[model samples]
Target chain A: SRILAVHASPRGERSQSRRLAEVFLAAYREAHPQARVARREVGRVPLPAVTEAFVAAAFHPQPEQRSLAMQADLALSDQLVGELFDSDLLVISTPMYNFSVPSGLKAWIDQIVRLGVTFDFVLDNGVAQFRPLLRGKRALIVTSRGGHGFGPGGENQAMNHADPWLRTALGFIGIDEVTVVAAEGEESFEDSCDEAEQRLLALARS
Target chain B: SRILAVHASPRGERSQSRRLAEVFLAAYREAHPQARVARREVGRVPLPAVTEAFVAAAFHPQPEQRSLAMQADLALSDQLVGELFDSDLLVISTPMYNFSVPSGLKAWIDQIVRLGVTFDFVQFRPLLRGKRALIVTSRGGHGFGPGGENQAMNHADPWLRTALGFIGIDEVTVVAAEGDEAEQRLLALARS
Candidate 1:
């Protein structure tokens, strides 16, 4: 199996999300020693914001019609998308920033989600349909948040945008099968860390 | 009263979100002629991503004793947070990208939602609470709400609301200029 591990925290080595990915990677490596693991450090090599040239070129309908500038604009996005297509399993470790993901992580998502590449914008029977170009892949998202009660029926459920938004993005690209592991209340020192770590280990082992 | 107009669509002047904001701002300006408006083009400025130095400086619990390096690290964040604190109203115009606000918008959020500068990191309560917000966005498709076909996939709306609220916004009104029905909805929202 080929695994693409994306680490998206500015804290780098000290981030709780990075820690979760470490535990997950260790267990995953033990389970499948032959597995090929590749890393994409988004926080470090931050992606540039999508530009008008990018949108125009990506949706230009014909590649031959695009200008040389357009091709240059999409080079990074193409590289990121290529990495995504080469992997079978995607592991994302991210922290919650402003009720959602860090900007760097979101920028990575923007780069990879290209029309006619990862997905096609189409209308079927007058309804908008996501024609995902890739399929049969699995993804695991590990998120670390500062406060508690961000889950279903929790006080902050309505405000918890990190996981839901990410899940929606992944599902949009045909990665419908996803497992989310969350470590909540990092600041309050709640005992949620142990339980979340156990869950991650179990999932990796299984 | 002061208003912060944040435009977060990479499409520049051609964005539907910006059009919606124009409508809202027109009415808002007419209503409060004396109000001051400050514009921040997030899509253009494209705030830098948060880093470890940013985290350390913002959450070090000792602002007075922070080193020069730490102070330098927080310069941009400080400027962004200063804008947030200076405004009573936030007018955000964004486009929905991959089920949520654009990356540029998210970057702006990362910059302003600092630990000690904007809120208490531990409590997660916003220090800038009770600010009024008007969010105008455009989505390519529709039914991104409760019981709609794309209800479960409607991350953009909820995320915007949550993010604004997390920063202590009390009142938020959203105008979604969706596909096919954008003109009708936008007009109605403007009148209301």
Candidate 2:
């Protein structure tokens, strides 16, 4: 099985979550030494938010006389969608920004989760619908935040937007078993590396 | 007090959440006519994704005699941070993009959420955290429910509250203005 370590943080070496993800990546690599461990760097190639142009290109099926510009626009989403569909085990590293997540991550979400390409929202028995394509994938996220107690009882716990938003997005893609190894307080490095390392160890069962 | 409405949907006019958000915005406006409604369309003015340069800038506040590009680079984050601090009430229309929010919205989040600016991450004591924001979200597909086959929730609705709560904006009520697109699933919004 192939393991795709998709690092979404735009900040290079300084990204806290990216560093923690290295730990999880280390374990995944060790578990399956023979498998091809591909690292898809989302940070290096930034993802642009979907635009009017993007919507038109993605939803439109016809491409008989489409211009080069239109093909280029459509190609961007296709690339991302292709990566996610091909991956086996996906590890994403992100940071909690504002009361949510980084823009790059959102762009990644937009690109991969396509209509009939990644999933088909078909009517089941006339009155029901459920995401069926995404069934047996393990998606793990190592997220770094600026504050503490943002998980459950923390003051900002209620605003813990990153995890919940993540759950919904990955779930849509058919990645059901997801785990978030959270590393909080990046601005206050007081426990960032330690917290990150500890979380990594736990995820790795090391 | 200005009622700033930030639309996070890339679909903009077509998003169902945007449709529902305007209703709430209208309600908020109905109470006060003179109140101004400001809009920062995430769709139009998409934020630049953070970079290694941005990380270096995050640490250094005062760029001594730096170039114009340098000053603006450092101030890019500060500029949005200030606007977020200035707002009295914020109405953000969110669409669950991956099990999370769209990239445009995330960019705004990165720009505005600064430490000692919008919030303080004190280790022990109750340092600083309070802001009012409402989440209006629409998910294309439904119910990755709890432990079910499709039950992944990070695509943004409940997850946003957690992210927002981190920055001290906890009073967020999520209106799942969506088509539960799940098999045999229905909610209150199904009627309206």
Candidate 3:
């Protein structure tokens, strides 16, 4: 088995999300000793933001009609998409920035979610029917938030954009089996950390 | 009144969102002849993403204790925040990429949404109050709006509302254009 770990924390070693991911990965490794891991640090080493040229190239109807310049524009996206396709289990460790994923992580998503590559659409009875190309893959999102009540049945449940948005994006690209474990209340409460760690461990073991 | 028109369409002139924004701005100008407009093309000229240094600088407990390097890191953020504060209306024209705003627009948001600047943390008190926002967006597929068939899959609308409201811009309006009826819908929204 192969796991692709995408870390989206600008805090590096100080990131709680990354730390929890480490805990999960260690347990995962113990269970599946032969599993190989690949890392992509989007937070520390930011990916290039999508440009006009890149969008034009990515949505071009005819791949054969694409010019050399268009192909060059999509080089980075192609590489990121290729990396995503190679992995069976995708792990994302991110911190909630402004109630959503950070710009760096979003940029990485823009690069990997290509039209003809990760997903495609067709017309069905004059309506668009979208389908995901990458099947038989699963995703795990481990997130850290500064304050509490950003989860289900919480005070700020309506404002919790990070996890829901990630799930929607991943599902759009065909990864339906997605699990989310969050380490919340980082700034206000300390007890949630231990609880989150326990849940991470249990989930990893399972 | 002053309006900050933020364009977040990489397609430039071909962008439906940008064109719709133009229609809105034109009608707005005709209605309020004395109003002035300032443009920030985040899509055409992308803004820098927030970095580790930027995060450290922005969240520093004591602003006075920040070193010169930290101050330098927050320079762009400060400028963006200043622009946001100076405007009465925040007009955002964007295309939904991956069911959300484009990376450029998100980068611009990251730059402006500072800890002690745009908002404060005393039970999440918003500092930039009394401002309004208008989000003019375009999508390739239909049913991404409120009460639509694919409303659950629509992140752009709710995300933008939350982000804008976080900074105290509570009066938010979203004009979404989809399929062939975009022009008429946009024109009606502009009139409204």
True contacts kept of 1: 0.87
True contacts kept of 2: 0.88
TM-scores, one per candidate: 0.91, 0.73, 0.95
> lDDT of candidate 3 vs native?
0.86
Ranking by lDDT: 3, 1, 2
Alpha carbon RMSD to native, model 2: 6.1
Docking class of 3: medium
**DockQ ranking from best to worst?**
1, 3, 2
lDDT of 1: 0.82
**DockQ of candidate 3 against the true complex:** 0.74
Error of 3 at B97 (Å): 1.0
Per-residue CA lDDT of candidate 1, range A1-206, in tens? 69899999888678898998889899989999998999998976677988888888888978878888889999999888888899999999999887888889998999999888898876789976768887878999998987777877898787778887788888878898899888887873446777778888898897
Interface RMSD of 2: 2.8
Report the lDDT tens digits of candidate 3 across residue range A1-206.
Answer: 68899999888789999998988899989999988888898988868888888878998989879999999999988888888899999999999988888888888998999887899989889977888999989999999999888988989988887888898899999998998888787883567778778888898788
All models: lDDT? 0.82, 0.67, 0.86
Give lDDT: candidate 2, residue B61: 49
